[PDB]
């Protein structure tokens, strides 16, 4: 087996836990949770969301 990375939060997705999405352009996204999923459908930016790994690494926290 393997573990993966939420498009939004960038989190380990242990098997089965979480949702998957396949846009018409064949981009396969994965979501650990409906929180991330709903934000994605809202077309939010994780780099702006604070608790996200992208914001974390863009503001240079936990270096």
């Amino acid at each position: 087996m393997k573990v993966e990375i939420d498009s939004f939060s960038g989190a380990k997705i242990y098997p089965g836990r979480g949702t998957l999405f396949v846009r018409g352009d064949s981009k396969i996204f994965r979501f650990q949770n409906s929180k991330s999923a709903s934000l994605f459908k809202q077309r939010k930016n994780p780099r702006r969301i604070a608790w996200t790994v992208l914001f974390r690494k863009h503001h240079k926290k936990g270096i």
Binding site: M1, K12, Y14, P15, R17, G62
Partner: protein, 386 residues
């Protein structure tokens, strides 16, 4: 006049009456078929339903598409501390059925089981089985002959056992007590086996083994007085309807001028005895051991109890069971396990099972981490972590 468009009986009538059980501990109606060629051993067990979780393994049915591929499966977990054998009774057979002629207990008893004899224990002399111990306190004064009576008679024997509700994390202190049939060897052997096992633990490593199909017998969760619509699966009547739509519209014809039993009706849902079968065991595991949650592939030392515990149960520090799928019964509840009655091979009951990974994540939410080590690793330190 006839039914214009056909459709089947809503619900199942073998499972009637849909009424509250006689107990919080489902009766075991039937045990397997006794045979003598095997050794004396139990044919049932008792534990407490703890909860569910989810695992991973490699299927093997030669002809599927997930043959030799991974899957993920919902399992159910039971906490099965070893049951204390105390006593046995003897059943002689009549044209009026099996019938107990003797119940032999043991000398010494635990507060939990004689509490189960009592109701108001906190104000009690605790006077129970004292004169039984005084029938004991000698060599065999009035016990040896009961045993030999059971030998001379009693085609069937059932061993009395009780649980360790104090080993559980529960808050009851009132042990559960029950009988199990023995389906091995001869009758003298059964009784002397039990005599050896008076006041003695018995465990799941002895009663069961992996890849065994069993029956789960328990009482299904109570849902109160309920309408016909959830209780039977009847069509919700339409929007425009005076005086209720969560109903059955016609409940019978003019003639017979009575309500037929088969018609649906509101009333008790749940707290029902149920006996589900063909539940493959996937893992026995040990309280007196760590790494219960760790397969040969993971090898990350971790028990089965997730972060923050089982919801409404706690920990699994006793011997435990992981079985495929669901079972009748809710969390914190008793459960009566049972060997099968029939040598189902089917290339489904013989599918040998070896595991890969076991979700030990928090069910009190949407848990991302199986371990706080992993948690701190992913997160870094924290304000509280000085």
């Amino acid at each position: 006049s006839h039914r214009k468009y056909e459709a089947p009986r809503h619900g199942h009538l073998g499972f009637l009456p849909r009424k509250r059980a006689a107990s919080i501990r489902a009766r075991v109606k039937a045990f397997p078929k006794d045979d003598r060629s095997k050794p004396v051993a139990l044919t049932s067990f008792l534990g407490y339903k703890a909860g569910m979780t989810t695992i991973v393994r490699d299927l093997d049915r030669p002809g599927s598409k997930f043959h030799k591929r991974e899957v993920v499966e919902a399992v159910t977990v039971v906490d099965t501390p070893p049951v204390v054998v105390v006593g046995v009774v003897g059943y002689v057979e009549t044209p009026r059925g099996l019938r107990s002629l003797t119940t032999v207990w043991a000398e010494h008893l635990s507060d939990e089981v004689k509490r189960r004899f009592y109701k108001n224990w906190y104000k009690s002399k605790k006077k129970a089985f004292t004169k039984y111990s005084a029938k004991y306190a000698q060599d065999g004064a009035g016990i040896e002959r009961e045993l030999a009576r059971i030998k001379k008679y009693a085609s069937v024997v059932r061993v009395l056992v009780h649980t360790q509700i104090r080993k559980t994390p529960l808050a009851q202190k009132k042990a559960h007590l029950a009988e199990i049939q023995l389906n091995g060897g001869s009758i003298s052997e059964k009784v002397d086996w039990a005599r050896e096992h008076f006041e003695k633990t018995v465990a799941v490593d002895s009663v069961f083994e992996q890849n065994e199909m069993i029956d789960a017998i328990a009482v299904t969760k109570g849902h109160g007085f309920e309408g016909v619509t959830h209780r039977w699966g009847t069509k919700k009547l339409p929007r425009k309807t005076h005086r209720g739509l969560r109903k059955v519209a016609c409940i019978g014809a003019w003639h017979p001028a009575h309500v037929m039993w088969s018609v649906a009706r509101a009333g008790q849902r749940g707290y029902h005895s149920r006996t589900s079968i063909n539940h493959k065991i996937y893992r026995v595991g040990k309280g007196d051991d760590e790494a219960n949650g760790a397969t040969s592939f993971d090898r990350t030392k971790k028990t089965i109890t997730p972060m923050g515990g089982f919801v409404h149960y706690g920990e699994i520090k006793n011997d435990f069971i992981m079985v495929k799928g669901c079972i009748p019964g809710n969390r914190k509840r008793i459960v009566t396990l049972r060997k099968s009655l029939y040598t189902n091979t089917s290339r489904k009951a013989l599918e040998e099972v070896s595991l890969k990974w076991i979700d030990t994540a928090s069910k009190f939410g949407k848990g991302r981490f199986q371990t706080p080590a992993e948690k701190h690793a992913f997160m870094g330190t924290l304000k509280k972590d000085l």
